[PDB]
Amino acid sequence: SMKNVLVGLGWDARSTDGQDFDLDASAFLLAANGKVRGDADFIFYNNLKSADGSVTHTGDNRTGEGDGDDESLKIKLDAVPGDVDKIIFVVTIHDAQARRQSFGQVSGAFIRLVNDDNQTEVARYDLTEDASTETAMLFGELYRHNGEWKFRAVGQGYAGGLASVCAQYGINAS
Ligand SMILES: [Ca+2]
Ligand SMILES: [Ca+2]
């Protein structure tokens, strides 16, 4: 029923001498056929907003400076074509993953979801909890039901596969 969704990621940044923590938010499209019509159809910094997906990214931060939802993504499900039938949101660590710095390395990052339609916080996962589990993580999922949108959390964690978690949605694993 959510007519408008707005995700918000936020975390405390720590500048020691130039280095800092910078998470990246993303969204992968997924068809109801069990495979996305093309994972490459995911919104990122290379796309200010979807032309027909009605999706729009607020902006990818570079440190987390902001006493509020650092990064965020606006999705007007009330304008999602009939092509896609399932969408998912994800938050992966930037290059800090190579230097071994999962979100846990941060002081305590947090995710937030709200329906820009009703303006009521829906939920928020704590990275400090699913952080010591890996480096990347999925907040939840979105799908259609009886002609009505419905969000569903799952809590998953990839051992680092920003390039894999993308196409991996196009093919199921063993
Ligand atoms: Ca970022
Ligand atoms: Ca922040």
Side-chain angles (χ1 to χ4, degrees):
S1 190
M2 288 171 190
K3 296 196 87 81
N4 199 163
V5 175
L6 203 175
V7 59
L9 184 75
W11 67 92
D12 303 281
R14 187 170 174 165
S15 159
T16 302
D17 60 85
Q19 305 190 178
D20 301 79
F21 313 122
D22 174 45
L23 272 59
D24 288 344
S26 198
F28 300 91
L29 287 56
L30 224 173
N33 184 95
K35 312 187 169 53
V36 65
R37 58 188 184 165
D39 57 308
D41 314 351
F42 76 107
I43 310 308
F44 212 61
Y45 75 78
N46 51 51
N47 294 314
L48 190 83
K49 48 165 174 185
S50 194
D52 313 334
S54 196
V55 195
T56 87
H57 198 335
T58 293
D60 177 272
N61 286 100
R62 295 194 64 165
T63 51
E65 285 173 278
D67 191 78
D69 45 294
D70 290 330
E71 298 189 350
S72 294
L73 218 85
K74 323 194 176 179
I75 319 91
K76 308 191 184 194
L77 331 183
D78 57 55
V80 163
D83 289 77
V84 305
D85 284 11
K86 169 174 295 209
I87 295 164
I88 49 165
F89 300 80
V90 194
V91 172
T92 76
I93 280 274
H94 195 31
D95 299 283
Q97 58 195 103
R99 281 60 163 164
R100 315 302 197 165
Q101 285 186 226
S102 46
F103 3 59
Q105 194 75 250
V106 187
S107 90
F110 71 91
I111 321 187
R112 181 168 170 165
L113 188 87
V114 58
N115 42 27
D116 172 54
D117 176 25
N118 194 34
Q119 200 184 186
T120 48
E121 58 196 337
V122 173
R124 39 175 305 165
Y125 202 104
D126 286 16
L127 274 290
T128 295
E129 299 184 1
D130 283 6
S132 291
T133 300
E134 63 296 271
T135 331
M137 195 185 151
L138 167 140
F139 170 58
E141 172 163 290
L142 187 86
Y143 80 106
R144 61 194 295 165
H145 192 61
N146 195 256
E148 313 183 292
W149 281 113
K150 183 163 165 65
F151 195 88
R152 178 170 172 165
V154 187
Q156 315 183 32
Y158 317 97
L162 173 53
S164 180
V165 306
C166 177
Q168 185 172 225
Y169 288 116
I171 182 169
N172 193 118
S174 78

PDB file of all heavy atoms in Angstrom, residues 9-13 64-70 110, ligand 2:
ATOM      1  N   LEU A   9      20.076   6.042   4.980  1.00  0.00           N
ATOM      2  CA  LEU A   9      21.228   5.387   5.670  1.00  0.00           C
ATOM      3  C   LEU A   9      22.036   6.475   6.376  1.00  0.00           C
ATOM      4  O   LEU A   9      22.241   7.546   5.840  1.00  0.00           O
ATOM      5  CB  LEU A   9      22.102   4.685   4.621  1.00  0.00           C
ATOM      6  CG  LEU A   9      23.247   3.908   5.296  1.00  0.00           C
ATOM      7  CD1 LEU A   9      22.717   2.622   5.947  1.00  0.00           C
ATOM      8  CD2 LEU A   9      24.292   3.539   4.237  1.00  0.00           C
ATOM      9  N   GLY A  10      22.493   6.226   7.574  1.00  0.00           N
ATOM     10  CA  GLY A  10      23.277   7.273   8.299  1.00  0.00           C
ATOM     11  C   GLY A  10      24.309   6.612   9.208  1.00  0.00           C
ATOM     12  O   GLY A  10      24.124   5.506   9.673  1.00  0.00           O
ATOM     13  N   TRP A  11      25.396   7.285   9.466  1.00  0.00           N
ATOM     14  CA  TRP A  11      26.435   6.694  10.348  1.00  0.00           C
ATOM     15  C   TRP A  11      27.408   7.780  10.806  1.00  0.00           C
ATOM     16  O   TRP A  11      27.523   8.826  10.198  1.00  0.00           O
ATOM     17  CB  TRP A  11      27.193   5.604   9.585  1.00  0.00           C
ATOM     18  CG  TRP A  11      27.987   6.217   8.474  1.00  0.00           C
ATOM     19  CD1 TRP A  11      29.275   6.621   8.570  1.00  0.00           C
ATOM     20  CD2 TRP A  11      27.570   6.501   7.108  1.00  0.00           C
ATOM     21  NE1 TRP A  11      29.675   7.135   7.348  1.00  0.00           N
ATOM     22  CE2 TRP A  11      28.659   7.082   6.415  1.00  0.00           C
ATOM     23  CE3 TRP A  11      26.365   6.312   6.408  1.00  0.00           C
ATOM     24  CZ2 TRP A  11      28.556   7.463   5.077  1.00  0.00           C
ATOM     25  CZ3 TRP A  11      26.257   6.695   5.061  1.00  0.00           C
ATOM     26  CH2 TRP A  11      27.350   7.269   4.397  1.00  0.00           C
ATOM     27  N   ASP A  12      28.107   7.536  11.879  1.00  0.00           N
ATOM     28  CA  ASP A  12      29.074   8.550  12.391  1.00  0.00           C
ATOM     29  C   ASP A  12      30.402   8.419  11.642  1.00  0.00           C
ATOM     30  O   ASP A  12      30.968   7.349  11.542  1.00  0.00           O
ATOM     31  CB  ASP A  12      29.310   8.318  13.884  1.00  0.00           C
ATOM     32  CG  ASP A  12      27.974   8.374  14.628  1.00  0.00           C
ATOM     33  OD1 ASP A  12      27.498   9.471  14.869  1.00  0.00           O
ATOM     34  OD2 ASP A  12      27.451   7.318  14.944  1.00  0.00           O
ATOM     35  N   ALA A  13      30.906   9.505  11.115  1.00  0.00           N
ATOM     36  CA  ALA A  13      32.200   9.453  10.371  1.00  0.00           C
ATOM     37  C   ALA A  13      33.353   9.733  11.338  1.00  0.00           C
ATOM     38  O   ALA A  13      33.187  10.408  12.335  1.00  0.00           O
ATOM     39  CB  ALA A  13      32.191  10.514   9.268  1.00  0.00           C
ATOM     40  N   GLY A  64      29.970  10.566   5.502  1.00  0.00           N
ATOM     41  CA  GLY A  64      28.824  10.341   6.439  1.00  0.00           C
ATOM     42  C   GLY A  64      28.540  11.632   7.205  1.00  0.00           C
ATOM     43  O   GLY A  64      27.733  11.665   8.112  1.00  0.00           O
ATOM     44  N   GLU A  65      29.200  12.700   6.846  1.00  0.00           N
ATOM     45  CA  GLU A  65      28.970  13.992   7.550  1.00  0.00           C
ATOM     46  C   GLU A  65      27.494  14.378   7.435  1.00  0.00           C
ATOM     47  O   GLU A  65      27.012  14.717   6.373  1.00  0.00           O
ATOM     48  CB  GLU A  65      29.836  15.080   6.909  1.00  0.00           C
ATOM     49  CG  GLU A  65      31.291  14.902   7.347  1.00  0.00           C
ATOM     50  CD  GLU A  65      32.181  15.879   6.576  1.00  0.00           C
ATOM     51  OE1 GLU A  65      32.532  15.567   5.450  1.00  0.00           O
ATOM     52  OE2 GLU A  65      32.495  16.922   7.125  1.00  0.00           O
ATOM     53  N   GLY A  66      26.772  14.328   8.522  1.00  0.00           N
ATOM     54  CA  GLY A  66      25.327  14.692   8.474  1.00  0.00           C
ATOM     55  C   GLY A  66      24.608  14.088   9.682  1.00  0.00           C
ATOM     56  O   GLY A  66      24.577  12.888   9.863  1.00  0.00           O
ATOM     57  N   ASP A  67      24.028  14.913  10.511  1.00  0.00           N
ATOM     58  CA  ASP A  67      23.310  14.386  11.707  1.00  0.00           C
ATOM     59  C   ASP A  67      21.948  13.835  11.282  1.00  0.00           C
ATOM     60  O   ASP A  67      20.945  14.070  11.925  1.00  0.00           O
ATOM     61  CB  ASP A  67      23.111  15.516  12.719  1.00  0.00           C
ATOM     62  CG  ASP A  67      22.635  14.929  14.050  1.00  0.00           C
ATOM     63  OD1 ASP A  67      23.465  14.408  14.776  1.00  0.00           O
ATOM     64  OD2 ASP A  67      21.448  15.011  14.320  1.00  0.00           O
ATOM     65  N   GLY A  68      21.905  13.101  10.203  1.00  0.00           N
ATOM     66  CA  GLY A  68      20.608  12.534   9.738  1.00  0.00           C
ATOM     67  C   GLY A  68      20.872  11.414   8.730  1.00  0.00           C
ATOM     68  O   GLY A  68      21.974  10.916   8.616  1.00  0.00           O
ATOM     69  N   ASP A  69      19.869  11.015   7.997  1.00  0.00           N
ATOM     70  CA  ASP A  69      20.063   9.928   6.997  1.00  0.00           C
ATOM     71  C   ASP A  69      21.078  10.378   5.944  1.00  0.00           C
ATOM     72  O   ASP A  69      20.753  11.100   5.023  1.00  0.00           O
ATOM     73  CB  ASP A  69      18.726   9.616   6.319  1.00  0.00           C
ATOM     74  CG  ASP A  69      18.030  10.924   5.942  1.00  0.00           C
ATOM     75  OD1 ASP A  69      17.653  11.654   6.843  1.00  0.00           O
ATOM     76  OD2 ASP A  69      17.885  11.175   4.755  1.00  0.00           O
ATOM     77  N   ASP A  70      22.307   9.958   6.074  1.00  0.00           N
ATOM     78  CA  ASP A  70      23.343  10.363   5.082  1.00  0.00           C
ATOM     79  C   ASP A  70      22.828  10.093   3.666  1.00  0.00           C
ATOM     80  O   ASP A  70      22.346  10.981   2.992  1.00  0.00           O
ATOM     81  CB  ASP A  70      24.621   9.558   5.323  1.00  0.00           C
ATOM     82  CG  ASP A  70      25.277  10.019   6.626  1.00  0.00           C
ATOM     83  OD1 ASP A  70      25.119  11.179   6.968  1.00  0.00           O
ATOM     84  OD2 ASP A  70      25.927   9.204   7.259  1.00  0.00           O
ATOM     85  N   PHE A 110      23.540   2.972  10.766  1.00  0.00           N
ATOM     86  CA  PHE A 110      22.122   2.528  10.938  1.00  0.00           C
ATOM     87  C   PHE A 110      21.322   2.783   9.657  1.00  0.00           C
ATOM     88  O   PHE A 110      21.548   3.742   8.947  1.00  0.00           O
ATOM     89  CB  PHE A 110      21.485   3.302  12.100  1.00  0.00           C
ATOM     90  CG  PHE A 110      21.260   4.743  11.701  1.00  0.00           C
ATOM     91  CD1 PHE A 110      20.047   5.126  11.114  1.00  0.00           C
ATOM     92  CD2 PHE A 110      22.264   5.694  11.915  1.00  0.00           C
ATOM     93  CE1 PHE A 110      19.838   6.460  10.745  1.00  0.00           C
ATOM     94  CE2 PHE A 110      22.056   7.027  11.545  1.00  0.00           C
ATOM     95  CZ  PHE A 110      20.844   7.412  10.961  1.00  0.00           C
TER      96      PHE A 110
HETATM   97 CA    CA B   2      25.914  10.705   9.385  1.00  0.00          CA
END
